[PDB]
Write a structure and sequence with these properties.
heterotetramer; A mainly alpha; B mainly beta; C mainly alpha; D alpha/beta; B: Methylamine Dehydrogenase, Chain H; 4-stranded antiparallel sheet; binds cholesterol; binds the ligand Cc1cc(C(F)(F)F)nc(Nc2ccccc2-c2nnn[nH]2)n1; transport (chain D); cell membrane (chain D)
Chain lengths: 284, 339, 55, 220
Amino acid sequence: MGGVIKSIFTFVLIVEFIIGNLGNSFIALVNCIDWVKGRKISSVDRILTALAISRISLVWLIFGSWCVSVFFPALFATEKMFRMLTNIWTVINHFSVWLATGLGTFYFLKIANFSNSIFLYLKWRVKKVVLVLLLVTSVFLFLNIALINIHINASINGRFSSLIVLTSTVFIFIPFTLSLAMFLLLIFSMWKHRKKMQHTVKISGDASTKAHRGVKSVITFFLLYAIFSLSFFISVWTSERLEENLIILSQVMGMAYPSCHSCVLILGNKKLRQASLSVLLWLR
Amino acid sequence: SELDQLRQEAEQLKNQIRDARKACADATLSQITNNIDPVGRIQMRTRRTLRGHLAKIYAMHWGTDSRLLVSASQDGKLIIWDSYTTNKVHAIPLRSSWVMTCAYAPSGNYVACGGLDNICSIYNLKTREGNVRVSRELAGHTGYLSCCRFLDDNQIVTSSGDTTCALWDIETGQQTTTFTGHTGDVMSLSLAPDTRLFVSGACDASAKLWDVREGMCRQTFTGHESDINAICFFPNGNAFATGSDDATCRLFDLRADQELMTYSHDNIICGITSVSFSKSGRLLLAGYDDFNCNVWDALKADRAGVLAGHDNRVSCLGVTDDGMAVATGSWDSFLKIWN
Amino acid sequence: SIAQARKLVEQLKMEANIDRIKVSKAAADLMAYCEAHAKEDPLLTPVPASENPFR
Amino acid sequence: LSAEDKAAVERSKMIDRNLREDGEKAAREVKLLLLGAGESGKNTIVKQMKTGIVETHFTFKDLHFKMFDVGAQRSERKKWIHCFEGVTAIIFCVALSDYDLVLEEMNRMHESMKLFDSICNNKWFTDTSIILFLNKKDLFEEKIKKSPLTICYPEYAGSNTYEEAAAYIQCQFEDLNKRKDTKEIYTHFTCSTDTKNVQFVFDAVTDVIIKNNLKDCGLF
Ligand SMILES: CC(C)CCC[C@@H](C)[C@H]1CC[C@H]2[C@@H]3CC=C4C[C@@H](O)CC[C@]4(C)[C@H]3CC[C@]12C
Ligand SMILES: Cc1cc(C(F)(F)F)nc(Nc2ccccc2-c2nnn[nH]2)n1
């Protein structure tokens, strides 16, 4: 039972390593080709290639951790490698997820339309706001590193993964909840605008270019939020309840976001979709 | 009856001038310069890139000191640059943001601009206050100003889209001479080096040699098949080059009164926005809207180089008085100095 | 229409009485100017970096 | 660098700062190009919303509007229509009270349709939305009772009421949008005794601004 489950999870980890490496490499490579072949780069493209680089680093960290654990368990048992892997993972993961929330704040401040004065003050200073969001949220990183190191010291003075995983998962929930709140507020703004443009202005005489192209991105984004909050709840409940196969499952769950969210980001950027179509054209 | 007789007389005079220009056509410029040494390849490189404009550049003009250049853009700005150090001397805010031409006075004391407001505004750079203020607003044109060129501190020649070139007196504010012989919109101007006569390329596929003092057209040059957007004298003053929308550049001789050479390629299917000659007259630099500039051998009609490096349509370019540098402006809000 | 036609006839008559030269003389004069001023042309013959104002 | 060279560098830095501030202020402004025919009627629109070209500035609900009128430019418009390539929208005003009138080689409505087909399908206005005003609906209502719409469009074959004729006219202008994938046409029915047009322009330009922000974010 345990052996076939571990084999299935190993196959899952190999598949998601392949998908994540291919997707994030595709994002970074497309932006790099567009940069070297004399073309303009938007700010969204810079944030996207920052996410791609960070997610390549994170998926390589977890795959290298799995390679070290499988090939050299004696090396894996040491406290030095464990503490080094834990701290490097938490730094890279904090940077990656807060860059994703920064991209979400960029979208929300650029697109959404509200009458509040504070919202407009943030709305006309988007670059300053995302830079401040990256710099201020380092207090979360310092407190996370502190609490994980306290847990490591307590474990080696009493390896306590049942609290390490819980602390890390709590520290991923805050940017996820901020991104979900910004997404819901953007959807509410678009719905209010649609209700306004459906009763004063007779919609359009064309009715072609509108949110009818963005509903595909909204649908493929809300699907990812649903199927990832489900896996949030499943992983937290299973890690809390009784599991003793925690390492491979947690190594699988840590690679889920940087592998699937890049594929979601491909389906939803016009440049990335055009590059994917050109790749599928010249491959044939 | 009388109209038909006058039309027949006009056709007779047109056939007479065509036969007269055929009789003085013994050889061709391509045949005569077929035994001269061709220049190999002009490899110019971007030295300074001038940043600061936020909309598309429509015009630049060099100074007579070959260091100061003024640029015009749709952001309502007229920036005077120091080309050696790449820094801004002045930033003049225009009353109308729809500028289509800019000029630099030979003394350096004034700059001009104009466009869709039909006003040639002249700015005083050397004032006792530290600002650049408006000296005059010359308003007599019906259509948009396309080009302006300074004769001296008191005279300026403006080309407009109301089928009219005008010569102004800045102190009085009135126009002294009106040049009215064209049929379409006049798009380009070029003053001769002796500053006594000028050519104007219009939208009737014609270029006309005007006399400043006399006020009458002397020659008409009809070779193009589309709108002439650019015109520039040879340094000798006895020839000029025209850049049109039929993807061809042509060299016209004043004394022979016809076309000597066509600068065309089959790979170019887009118009010419700006033309400029070298100091020696050997290189003709033409700015195209295929995003780059082409260097032509003016005596052999062969491309010698490409000034690629602009991400949009190269709208304006000019060679300095000493011939050291070529500055190209384009719609991507950048000015690049080549050498 | 009569005045415009008369002006066109007068302009075409004034443009006909022009002392014309051959294409050979014009080509020779342009070639002579380009050969005479060839040394003082930085774009044709590139100057060294010591005397180049844009280095 | 000398002392004067350093001070010139500082002066250039101040000039660059002022240029950046002016550009950030100007990017939040709404630019509108107002187009129409001679007898279509645009002076009543400018009066309700407030040689060479005329710039009209007005502020409505924390938006600065810049309206440009190029109707006085009696030159070849192919040589300056690229100056308005970056513009938020084009306001095309069409009187629908002159289907029965004539300029005789074309009708007034046919001339307006030809101008609309030239502007909408221009190479510089592929992604520039058009706000269409149908002016003089009172004269159109008082004129459709006597003179039928068969005079202008001979292939009408419909009820000669106000609403069906107005809908047919709106459809005939909106069927000239050959792009129909990257631009939108907003249609309003106006009259002289009505002050609501600035609200329609505000709603349409908010929609255009949302679409432009989505395009800049890369979601289109
Ligand atoms: C949000 C939830 C569902 C997923 C978050 C992923 C976290 C909990 C996972 C992803 C990678 C994991 C690490 C991978 C490798 C090791 C080495 C081993 O000694 C166990 C602990 C440690 C250090 C893991 C701790 C938990 C970990 C950090
Ligand atoms: C692919 C796509 C499309 C769309 C759109 F349909 F609205 F255009 N929106 C998003 N995202 C967000 C929107 C608001 C706030 C946060 C995010 C966010 N969360 N994570 N990353 N961005 N994404």
